[PDB]
Amino acid sequence: PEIVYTHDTGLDYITYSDYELDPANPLAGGAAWIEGAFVPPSEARISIFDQGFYTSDATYTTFHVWNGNAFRLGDHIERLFSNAESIRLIPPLTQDEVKEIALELVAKTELREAMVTVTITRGYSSTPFERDITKHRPQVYMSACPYQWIVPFDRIRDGVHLMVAQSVRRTPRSSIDPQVKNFQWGDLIRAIQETHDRGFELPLLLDCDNLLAEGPGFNVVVIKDGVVRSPGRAALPGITRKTVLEIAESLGHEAILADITPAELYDADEVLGCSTGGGVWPFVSVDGNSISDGVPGPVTQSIIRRYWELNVEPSSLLTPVQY
Amino acid sequence: VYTHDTGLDYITYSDYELDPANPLAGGAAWIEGAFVPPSEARISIFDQGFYTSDATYTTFHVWNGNAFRLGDHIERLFSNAESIRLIPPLTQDEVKEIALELVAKTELREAMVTVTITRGYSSTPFERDITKHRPQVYMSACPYQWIVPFDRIRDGVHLMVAQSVRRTPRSSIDPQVKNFQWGDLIRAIQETHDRGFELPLLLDCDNLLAEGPGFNVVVIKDGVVRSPGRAALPGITRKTVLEIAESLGHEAILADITPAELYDADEVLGCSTGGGVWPFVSVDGNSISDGVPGPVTQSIIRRYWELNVEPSSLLTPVQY
Ligand SMILES: Cc1ncc(COP(=O)(O)O)c(C=O)c1O
Ligand SMILES: Cc1ncc(COP(=O)(O)O)c(C=O)c1O
């Protein structure tokens, strides 16, 4: 269908920019960068012989732009180059080059509120058993699309009903490491499918030890007696998570990575979720069991509000897109 | 390169030449209804097949103009699709017809054909409305690919048991559903670079034999032929190896196999659509028996290649 790039959010702390996309611009509202070319979404295609597809031999990051400012761009590209190195990928561009191109890509979409995926793959120039690393030709692929909300505005305000998956667990670090962001979502998709079977909105997975892990596209945070905790092991080192723990410490709470049991999840004062794709939101029940009184808690509410302020308040967290 | 002189009496390419006028000669893909050359075989980065690897596939081969075990391959593909709740947008008959025609267009008498079914680009992962899903089929046919060279089919291969990674459990990403999610397989390949071995074998979370990147392992001991039952793709080559083993009068079974049984084996071998059957003559530098290929493996290897040329229901002729 047609492109939807702004909304009236029911929420005083989230406001889209007031502007119009130019219909003569074939990149307006969405675009990719593929092998040196800025192209429209319908032409955003990669080789089926790229190992990024047939062996998912790839890592990526996803950042966002809000009111014409990219949020924590440095952290994101640094995390991306760290993940590349963890899987022995040498990026074909420097971090600076990648920032320059991603920011120009956003600019060409004219999008003031955007999500930008930067992906690095092993390439199509070699195959998986290639010993000679000089034969590997890694690729960079980028997309900039309208901002996407994992949970709608009304659930950011009223909260989401969480489900702990029983039919599947998060892939162990000794197989496919969740700390390296990747497209290998077999377990995460099974979890989604289980939410369909059980009638819930979002799943959280446990790890091999039955400790909280993460969900598809989000980290979970658990608050108890003024201590703010988030899973340290089987979870992506989220940049939203990092922000949430910084805000928590600002509010005077102990904020740490930790192992969290399911009993501690059920017994929490407050539970929330976070991600670049939607910000921060409350989880007000788990498996149909209320967290406290089943409405978003006050700590969660101040975290959410503060996260959105950090998206507009001038600071080193914000990098202006040159439209 | 689409032919070789193999130096092996039981492996022989066809004698022919590709027509250079034909832009699909020697390799091609089938993408969204179109037969295209390799260079134009691209898919949408908004296909969930890419960004969530929401996809399954199979790879069958063609030898001397015949597809080998095509029925088994497409049955496995459709079972794997059903396992991840994928409704293929084509029937098994249709996939076979398109795939055989793809091969015909490449003129390849020896080839590997990948058939992939993805969740598509018309929806995103959280879409609850399954009628919105629009799965895509992508196919490719390229020259036959050898996981191990001809001289090592003859002489045998030096195996390594991966210690820095294990095979993904069935409770996360099921190895019995053929998939592109090779993060662990790639790590194992990298560990073989580090430790100086040719191929890796992975263990499962219980430390029992799993499989390797692109191959099943088979362990032979006191006349009994065994292959890992759990953390392993149900290979079509594996199936053939066990049928061959039975025909030779050996007990042939899937089982749980320990590392001690691997080192203590009479014979070990590997198998794959991408290269047939080959010997593993050492593990972690320790000889399997006398460190040369064993007679059971050699018999199985030869019979496998025989099954690739003797007329039977195992072979489907491509109409070039
Ligand atoms: C599996 C998973 N966990 C967590 C996150 C959130 O991380 P970040 O806050 O850096 O977006 C994502 C984002 O896509 C994800 O895919
Ligand atoms: C992980 C894995 N195991 C086993 C096999 C062997 O399966 P088959 O004999 O059906 O080709 C493959 C083939 O690609 C594979 O990728």
Numbering used by the authors:
A (entry chain B): 8 to 330
B (entry chain A): 11 to 330
What did the article's authors report about this structure?
ATAs transfer an amino group of a chiral amine compound to a ketone compound using the cofactor pyridoxal 5’-phosphate (PLP) with a high turnover rate, stable catalytic activity, broad substrate specificity and excellent stereoselectivity, which is achieved by a proposed large-binding pocket (L pocket) and small-binding pocket (S pocket) in the substrate-binding site8910111213141516. Each protomer (subunit) of the dimeric enzymes shows a structural architecture typical of the fold-type IV class of PLP-dependent enzymes, which are made up of two domains. The substrate-binding site is surrounded by the cavity among the two domains, the cofactor PLP, and the loop consisting of the residues 129–145 of the other protomer. The substrate-binding site can be divided into two parts as described initially, the L pocket and the S pocket, which is consistent with the previously proposed mechanism for the substrate specificity of ATAs in which the smaller and larger atomic groups of substrates are recognized by the S and L pockets, respectively.
An improved R-ATA, designated as ATA-117-Rd11 was derived from ATA-117, a homolog of Ab-R-ATA, by the substrate walking approach for use in the synthesis of sitagliptin, on an industrial scale, whereas both Ab-R-ATA and ATA-117 could not produce such a large compounds. The molecular engineering of ATA-117-Rd11 involved 27 mutations that made this ATA conquer the severe reaction problems in the realistic industrial production, such as a high concentration of organic solvent, a high temperature for enhancing the solubility of prositagliptin ketone, and a high concentration of amine donor isopropylamine for prompting the product accumulation. In the final biocatalyst ATA-117-Rd11, Val69, Phe122, and Ala284 (in the S pocket of Ab-R-ATA) were mutated to Thr, Met, and Gly, respectively. Comparison of the active site pockets of the Ab-R-ATA and ATA-117-Rd11 shows that the volume of S pocket is enlarged by the three mutations. Similarly, His62 (in the L pocket of Ab-R-ATA) was mutated to Thr to increase the volume of the active site around it by reducing the volume of the amino acid side chain. The loops 129–145 of the G136F mutant and ATA-117-Rd11 showed significantly different conformation from that of the wild-type, depending on the amino acid residue at the position 136. Gly136 was located near Val152 in the wild-type, whereas Phe136 was distant from Val152 in the G136F mutant and ATA-117-Rd11, accompanied by the long-range alteration of the loop’s backbone conformation. The residue 136 was moved into the L pocket by the alteration of the loop, leading to a probable hydrophobic interaction between Phe136 and the cyclic group of pro-sitagliptin ketone. Simultaneously, Arg138 was moved away from the substrate-binding site by the alteration of the loop, resulting in an enlargement of the cavity to accommodate large substrates.
